[PDB]
Design a protein around this nucleic acid. Sequence first.
RNA 1: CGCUCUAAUUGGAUGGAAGCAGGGGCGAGAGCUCCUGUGGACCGAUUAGUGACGAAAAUCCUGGCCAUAGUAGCAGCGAUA
RNA 2: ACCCUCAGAAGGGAGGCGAAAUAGAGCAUGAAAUCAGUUGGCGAUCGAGCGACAGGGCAUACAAGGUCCCUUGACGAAUGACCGAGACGCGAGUCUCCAGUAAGACUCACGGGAAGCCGAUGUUCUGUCGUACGUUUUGAAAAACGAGCCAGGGAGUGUGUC
Lengths: 142, 49, 150, 142
Amino acid sequence: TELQARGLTEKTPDLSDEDARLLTQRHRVGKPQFNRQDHHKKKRVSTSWRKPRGQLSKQRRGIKGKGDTVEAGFRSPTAVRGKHPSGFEEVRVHNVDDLEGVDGDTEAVRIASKVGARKRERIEEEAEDAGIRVLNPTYVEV
Amino acid sequence: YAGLRTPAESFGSGRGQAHVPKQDGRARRVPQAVKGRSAHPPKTEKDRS
Amino acid sequence: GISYSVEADPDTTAKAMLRERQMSFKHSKAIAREIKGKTAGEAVDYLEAVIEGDQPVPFKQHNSGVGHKSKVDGWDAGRYPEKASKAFLDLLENAVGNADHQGFDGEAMTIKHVAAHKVGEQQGRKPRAMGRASAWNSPQVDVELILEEP
Amino acid sequence: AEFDADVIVDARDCIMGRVASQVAEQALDGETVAVVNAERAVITGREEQIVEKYEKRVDIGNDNGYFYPKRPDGIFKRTIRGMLPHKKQRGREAFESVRVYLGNPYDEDGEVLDGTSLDRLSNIKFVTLGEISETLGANKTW
RNA sequence: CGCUCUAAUUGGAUGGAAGCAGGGGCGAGAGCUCCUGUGGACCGAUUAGUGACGAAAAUCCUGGCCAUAGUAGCAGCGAUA
RNA sequence: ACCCUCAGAAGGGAGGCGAAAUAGAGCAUGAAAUCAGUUGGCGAUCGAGCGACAGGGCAUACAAGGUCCCUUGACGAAUGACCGAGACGCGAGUCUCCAGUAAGACUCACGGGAAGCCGAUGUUCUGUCGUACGUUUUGAAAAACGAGCCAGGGAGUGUGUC
Ligand SMILES: [Cl-]
Ligand SMILES: [Cl-]
Ligand SMILES: [Cl-]
Ligand SMILES: [Cl-]
Ligand SMILES: [Cl-]
Ligand SMILES: [Cl-]
Ligand SMILES: [Cl-]
Ligand SMILES: [Mg+2]
Ligand SMILES: [Mg+2]
Ligand SMILES: [Mg+2]
Ligand SMILES: [Mg+2]
Ligand SMILES: [Mg+2]
Ligand SMILES: [Mg+2]
Ligand SMILES: [Mg+2]
Ligand SMILES: [Mg+2]
Ligand SMILES: [Mg+2]
Ligand SMILES: [Mg+2]
Ligand SMILES: [Mg+2]
Ligand code: NA
Ligand code: NA
Ligand code: NA
Ligand code: NA
Ligand code: NA
Ligand code: NA
Ligand code: NA
Ligand code: NA
Ligand code: NA
Ligand code: NA
Ligand code: NA
Ligand code: NA
Ligand SMILES: [Sr+2]
Ligand SMILES: [Sr+2]
Ligand SMILES: [Sr+2]
Ligand SMILES: [Sr+2]
Ligand SMILES: [Sr+2]
Ligand SMILES: [Sr+2]
Ligand SMILES: [Sr+2]
Ligand SMILES: [Sr+2]
Ligand SMILES: [Sr+2]
C-alpha cells in the first residue's frame, strides 16, 4: 500500500578517516557559484562560465563584490574530488555486464537514463545481490 | 558563387543603417547576412589525400 | 487558439469561449477582470449598464490619458467599451445556454474563471508620408469562461 | 501624549552636541530617550557667529526644500538626527524612539549625563537654544 | 570541455530514444550526470580521424516580440451639411 | 454523425473517431522574447549596475541530495586571560607571579533533539564590497562609441612555394 525503493538505499561506503575528513571538509567549504559575469543583467547572457576578458572588467580586475574568478586554488581535495555526497564513488552502468567488477563497499552504481524499465529490473535485482547500492532506484509498491 | 549572385550594394552612412549590402531592402552577399556567402567553406581545390 | 487554462468538474461547471474576436484585448482584460466572480446574470446586467453608459469599467492597467470617472470606486480611470462588452454578452449567452441545456441554473451561477488572451493580430497597412507605409492591425482575441454552481 | 522613556535627560545648562552624541549612542542601544528642557540647552561660541550659522540654515532651500527647524524643540531633535543613520531601518528606529520636549512634561526630573554640563561660572560665551530660537523668529511658546 | 560526420571496438531505446520543461548530484571550470513531466523515434561511449565546430557585442543579418499606447491620425483646403 | 446555442455551412457547448484531437488542417516536437490568468516572496515613509560572499523571514508532495541543532567530553595551531598576591608610576596605566594556564578554529564520541528539518530552490530583510558589458583610450560610470528584447545566423580558409 506504499512505495519503496529497490536495492540497498541506506548502504554507506566505508572511508579511511582521512577521506572521511577530506570529504567532510569539502561539504563544509563549498565554493562560489562561478556564473558568468552579469549573466543576471541580460537574458541573452547565460549562467555558463566564461572568462571575463574585458580590459576594464570589474570581475577580471578582481574587485570585491564582482564575484570570484575560476582558479586552481578552488579545486576540491584530490582524495575525495568527485565523490557522491554519500561518500561513494559513482559507477556509470548501462547493463548487467557493467556491474561486474564493482565493489559495493566503495562504489555505488548509477544506471544510465536511457536504460529501459525491463533491463533496469535485472540490473537492479542483480546489483543488489552483489552488495552494490544503486543511486537512482525504482520505487515499487509493497 | 553561392550568395555572390546579386548586385547588392551598401547604402553607406545616412539612414541609421549599418553599412551592409542590401538589395530590395533584403540585406546580402556578405557572410554575416542570411542568404549571404559562406566565409570559409569546404573547397574542391583541396588535396584530401 | 487557446484551451481552458483551468480545471473544471463537468458535474458542477459549464464552459464557453470566444474565438479570434476582433476587439480590444486591452478592453477585454478590463471587462474580464471586472466581472470575474459575479453571477452570470449580474455580469450581464453589469455589461448592459456599461454598454448603456451607466456603469463604467475600471481601466487600471491600460489607462494613459484615460479620464477619471466618478462612479469608479477605489480607482480613478475607466471607460464604457460597448463593443468588447457586447462580445462578452454573446459569451455569457453561450455559457448560460449550455449551462441550462445541462440542467444548471445558468444565471445563478458564479463566474469561476474568465480571462482574455491575445490570439494574434490581423495585419494591415496604412500609407504615410515620404512614400512609407506602416502597420495598422486589428487584435484577434480569445476569451474563456467557466461557470460553477454557487 | 505619553512617552515611556527608559531615560529622561535634563538638557538645562548642557552642551547640546555632547548631549546629542550620548543620547544617540544610547538610542542605538535600544534605549528610549526623552530630552527635557530643550530650550534651556546651551552651545558654546560667539552668539553673533552661532546665530549667523543657524540663520543661514533657515535661508537655505529651493523647490526640493531644506526644511530647517527654529524651535529649541527639534533644533535639538535635528542635531540628534545628524548623529543617526536615520535613513536605515535600525537608525530611523532609534531616532524615532527619542523625543525632545520644551521644559519638562514628566513628573520625574531628567538626569545630567556626564561631561555634558556647562558651568556658568567659568564661561560667558555660550547661548541658549531659546535665545537662538527667538532670534530665528520662532514664537516663544515656552 | 563541447559540436558534426567517418572508421574500428563496444553499448542503450516502444518495459519509451533525441528534444524540451522543472528539479536533484558531480567538476575550479569548459561541462558531465540523474529524477519527474512532455515527447514518440532514434541515441551513445572509447579510440583514431573529419571540420561550413562554440557569440553578448560588429549603427552586424533574418525572424518573432514588448514598452511606447488604446496614444498621434480619422479637424484645418472658400466644397463647414 | 446527432443534439443544444446563435443572425449563423461561423463560433461555442456536449458528443463521435483514434494509442494520441494538448494529432482537427502551415494539424510531429513546440525553446526564448513575450501575453492572459494564477501561486509564492515583497509592497503605497521610501533610493538607483540590479549583484558577490555572510546571516536572518516566509515559501517547498515524491524522485534524483541527507544532513542539521544543543549539554558534555576528547583533541586543541597561532593567540592568550579574568581574579588574587607583590611591586612601580603624578597619572591614564604597567611589571612579576598565577600561566603559555583557563581559553582557542576544525574534527570525533556519548546523550538529547530537528523533517520545511539540514542541503537545496524562489523571494525578501540585514552586514560588508559594489557607478554594467565590449570597444576606443595615458585615463570610461562617463556628458566618448554599440545595442530595445529573444531565438537562429555570423569572422584564421584553399593552393603553390619557403
Ligand atoms: Cl587541475
Ligand atoms: Cl493590445
Ligand atoms: Cl526651502
Ligand atoms: Cl542614514
Ligand atoms: Cl567664556
Ligand atoms: Cl578537519
Ligand atoms: Cl587564429
Ligand atoms: Mg540571463
Ligand atoms: Mg546561402
Ligand atoms: Mg486624454
Ligand atoms: Mg508619393
Ligand atoms: Mg574501445
Ligand atoms: Mg550558434
Ligand atoms: Mg563576443
Ligand atoms: Mg503619453
Ligand atoms: Mg454651410
Ligand atoms: Mg504544432
Ligand atoms: Mg580622448
Ligand atoms: Na541573381
Ligand atoms: Na583536390
Ligand atoms: Na497606471
Ligand atoms: Na467612487
Ligand atoms: Na472615485
Ligand atoms: Na558651535
Ligand atoms: Na530652510
Ligand atoms: Na539599429
Ligand atoms: Na534565503
Ligand atoms: Na569603439
Ligand atoms: Na566601458
Ligand atoms: Na563624462
Ligand atoms: Sr529516461
Ligand atoms: Sr499603465
Ligand atoms: Sr560611547
Ligand atoms: Sr561558424
Ligand atoms: Sr505593439
Ligand atoms: Sr467633418
Ligand atoms: Sr493643412
Ligand atoms: Sr469535445
Ligand atoms: Sr594547549
